[PDB]
Amino acid sequence: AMATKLVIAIVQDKDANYLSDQFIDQNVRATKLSTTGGFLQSGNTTFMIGIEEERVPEVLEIIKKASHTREEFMTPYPIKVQVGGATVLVLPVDQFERF
Amino acid sequence: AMATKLVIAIVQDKDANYLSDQFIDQNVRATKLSTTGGFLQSGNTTFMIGIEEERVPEVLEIIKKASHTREEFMTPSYPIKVQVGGATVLVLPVDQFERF
Amino acid sequence: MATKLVIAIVQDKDANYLSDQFIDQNVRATKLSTTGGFLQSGNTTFMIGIEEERVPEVLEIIKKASHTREEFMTPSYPIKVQVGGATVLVLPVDQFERF
């Protein structure tokens, strides 16, 4: 009855710190890779998360809050500029073990 | 309401440059990792692609062309024909896919 | 064809022996270096495309190579310290190609 799923969240380096700390204080075993992506093929991070099915939406909301797309004020006259964004996918898991 | 899959493509560092560019000019959101593999446990690169089911075959063809196994002529630091490239790829189902 | 993918997350200290194990065992693993755990420290992840029939074989290779245990460590009176431990999940795959 151990219905397990894997969530893969791709996320911006900026938000990756706060998120990973969130996961911990939220009792979520995440493992973090660093990747590239985007038009400019810049750096970002990817998370992989073995989690029980029942808890997924908990996890997704954790992410949304941490890394949703927003705009902020930035100076090179400050300007509103867009930051953040997360793409995430949750895969099924046939079997899950800890050794 | 659009069934998406995830393709994972493992590929030669040599061809990863061209491919990744291809993905972009062809509107494929791939994310690229730096890995090791093979008998020598040397460096290659892995790709991860969240894409709609209907589009998978397209993506595979993009890969095959960009990274299939071939032979090339190479002089050793008189020339000889050696094998290069090669790509392994898996496509797996995804239950749910969100952008935030 | 009946391919499955195993992701195995495993401690840096065990990863060398494991990766050699895979090779000598005709298992094609690809290896990422990642971080995880409470302290957010380096470990390593493996991804392994494999015929369904061989999964338990692979799993055993892993359990043996990376299971959790205690060893004798000296702080820089030897002491028993716990080490290793792996966590692994095997997922289905719809389609597998080599090019």
Side-chain angles (χ1 to χ4, degrees), chain B residues 5 41 69 87 89-91, chain C residues 19 94-99:
Chain B
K5 316 259 95 172
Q41 231 174 131
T69 304
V89 4
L90 338 152
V91 19
Chain C
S19 68
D94 286 348
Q95 169 195 353
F96 172 101
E97 295 297 321
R98 190 241 145 151
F99 291 149

Side-chain angles (χ1 to χ4, degrees), chain A residues 4-63:
Chain A
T4 273
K5 303 258 145 286
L6 166 69
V7 9
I8 306 175
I10 307 100
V11 123
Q12 249 157 34
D13 283 352
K14 346 300 148 180
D15 306 328
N17 276 357
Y18 175 84
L19 220 197
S20 59
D21 293 16
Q22 225 49 30
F23 281 154
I24 305 207
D25 299 344
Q26 283 309 314
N27 181 20
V28 178
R29 310 295 256 75
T31 139
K32 180 210 295 200
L33 309 62
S34 57
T35 41
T36 75
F39 195 83
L40 298 180
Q41 249 167 120
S42 291
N44 58 190
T45 91
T46 313
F47 283 98
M48 296 188 192
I49 300 185
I51 204 64
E52 41 257 314
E53 186 162 7
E54 23 284 348
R55 277 189 92 186
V56 163
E58 180 194 354
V59 174
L60 264 54
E61 196 58 26
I62 300 179
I63 300 173

Side-chain angles (χ1 to χ4, degrees), chain B residues 5 8 10 33 35-39 41 46 48 60 63-64 67-69 83 86-93, chain C residues 3 5 15-16 19-20 23-24 28-33 47-50 91-99:
Chain B
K5 316 259 95 172
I8 307 180
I10 307 98
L33 306 57
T35 43
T36 80
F39 194 86
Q41 231 174 131
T46 312
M48 272 166 147
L60 289 201
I63 299 177
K64 179 158 165 173
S67 60
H68 63 268
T69 304
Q83 176 184 128
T88 135
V89 4
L90 338 152
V91 19
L92 17 179
Chain C
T3 285
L5 168 71
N16 278 341
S19 68
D20 285 326
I23 305 194
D24 287 358
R28 302 195 73 100
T30 141
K31 139 164 78 165
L32 320 59
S33 60
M47 293 174 309
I48 311 185
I50 231 296
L91 348 189
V93 357
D94 286 348
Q95 169 195 353
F96 172 101
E97 295 297 321
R98 190 241 145 151
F99 291 149

